[PDB]
Design a protein around this ligand. Structure first.
Ligand SMILES: [Cl-]
Ligand SMILES: [Cl-]
Length: 291
């Protein structure tokens, strides 16, 4: 059974999904834009036998509160940090996708000993040019429009394009009507959609925004030097991560195994939950037995 809980955090509240035996290591699942802990619903039960699974809804997403903030990357850093402290988590495996990987990389860079292992996919990295972002002309044009004043507000705040187009368009299988009802539930109003507009405007592309760009460059330098166990999952063709890029990226990290899932785009949990869950569970069991 998965439980949906709430925990007071800073000036607001955060929801999180929880399951697993509490005497096992913690695994923290970190979603990105514009999902929530719901995207881990078919993975968490498969890791539950070996770990204490904790999957928060980032502030402003899912069933978490909606404080009056900018929802910058650095805001998410503060709320996630506060969430981890409030639950008393002193060390954890991290499982992450999209902006959840930026949060995971930055957490690991600040507290390297916190990470028991990092399983990541479809991750954010500093992108020196627009040619380094994604793979398709239509994605490049759309995210350029997100980052254009006025245009981005119309597409995302008024028309909810990140939830209604980018999310189902970046998954191979068809989402059910109920699944899309869940994913749009946090975002019924223009004002509620602010976090899904701020995130693409935070993506580190061509040096902007400079603070995120610098921060993720440092995070990736720490990642490259780190020696904790790592799993990089990839889809084909993928989206932010192509198979060929994943192969080189993992081969240039220390202690990183590459898992090729097959047909996938950006939100790989919706196309390969059992492969991801079973692989993570076996990887944790391996690492825990090795102690
Ligand atoms: Cl996600
Ligand atoms: Cl984004």
């Amino acid at each position: 059974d998965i439980s949906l809980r709430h925990v007071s955090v800073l000036d607001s509240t955060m929801a999180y999904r929880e399951t697993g035996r509490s005497d096992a290591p913690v695994v923290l699942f970190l979603h990105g834009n514009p999902t929530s802990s719901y995207i881990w619903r078919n993975i968490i039960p498969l890791v539950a036998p070996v770990a204490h699974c904790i999957a928060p809804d980032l502030i402003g997403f899912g069933q978490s509160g909606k404080p009056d903030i900018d929802y910058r990357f650095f805001d998410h850093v503060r709320y996630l940090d506060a969430f981890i402290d409030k639950l008393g988590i002193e060390s954890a495996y991290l499982v992450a996708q999209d902006w959840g990987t930026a949060l995971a990389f930055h957490l690991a860079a600040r507290r390297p000993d916190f990470v028991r292992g990092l399983a990541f996919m479809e991750f954010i990295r500093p992108m020196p040019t627009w040619d380094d972002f994604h793979q398709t002309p239509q994605a490049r044009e759309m995210f350029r429009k997100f980052r254009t004043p006025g245009v981005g507000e119309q597409m995302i705040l008024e028309d909810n394009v990140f939830v209604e187009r980018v999310l189902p368009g970046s998954i191979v299988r068809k989402l059910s009507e109920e699944e899309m009802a869940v994913y749009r539930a946090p975002f019924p109003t223009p004002e509620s959609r602010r976090p899904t507009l701020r995130f693409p405007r935070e993506l580190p592309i061509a040096g902007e925004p400079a603070d995120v760009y610098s921060t993720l460059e440092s995070a990736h330098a720490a990642l490259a030097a780190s020696t904790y166990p790592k799993l990089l999952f990839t889809g084909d063709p993928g989206a932010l991560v192509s198979p060929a890029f994943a192969e080189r990226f993992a081969a240039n990290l220390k202690n990183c195994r590459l898992i090729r899932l097959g047909a996938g785009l950006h939100y790989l949990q919706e196309d390969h939950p059992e492969a991801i869950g079973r692989t993570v569970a076996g990887w944790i069991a391996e690492i825990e037995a090795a102690s």
